[PDB]
Design a protein around this ligand. Sequence first.
Ligand SMILES: CCCCc1ccccc1
Length: 164
Amino acid sequence: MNIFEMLRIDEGLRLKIYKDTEGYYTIGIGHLLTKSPSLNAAKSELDKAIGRNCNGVITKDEAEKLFNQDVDAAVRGILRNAKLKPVYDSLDAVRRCAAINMVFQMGETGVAGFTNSLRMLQQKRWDEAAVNLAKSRWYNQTPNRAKRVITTFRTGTWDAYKNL
Ligand SMILES: CCCCc1ccccc1
């Protein structure tokens, strides 16, 4: 398992514009197009992202290219964030994947309220961190995915992803 396989499981793959769990236009492997309610706005964003007139549909290769870009952006975002970088650097490889997964899903503003969880992760208090992480809108709105990510933080293993 690696971060690409993990997020591919969590986000799926859809080649036509769809609405994500929050109702936002998205495509590919969880590539957010816009938070605007306008499908036309989403189609514009898609054409801009892909560099051709897509009419709301992309190829698998195009989806995988956006995915590579998005994963890279997520990781670089962590390394540029003064709050996140030290915790990330303190983690092992498997737990780093859990970190990237969360930032991929919610961005850095979205993890802003996780100060206490970050502290527990940095301290390697894994059970405590796991309990704290579940006290979140994140957990309540996407519990199956959050449980997988939390299990990954708790154990430092891929046990939650092994049965897909
Ligand atoms: C739980 C805080 C958001 C995810 C995260 C955890 C550790 C390091 C970077 C990012």
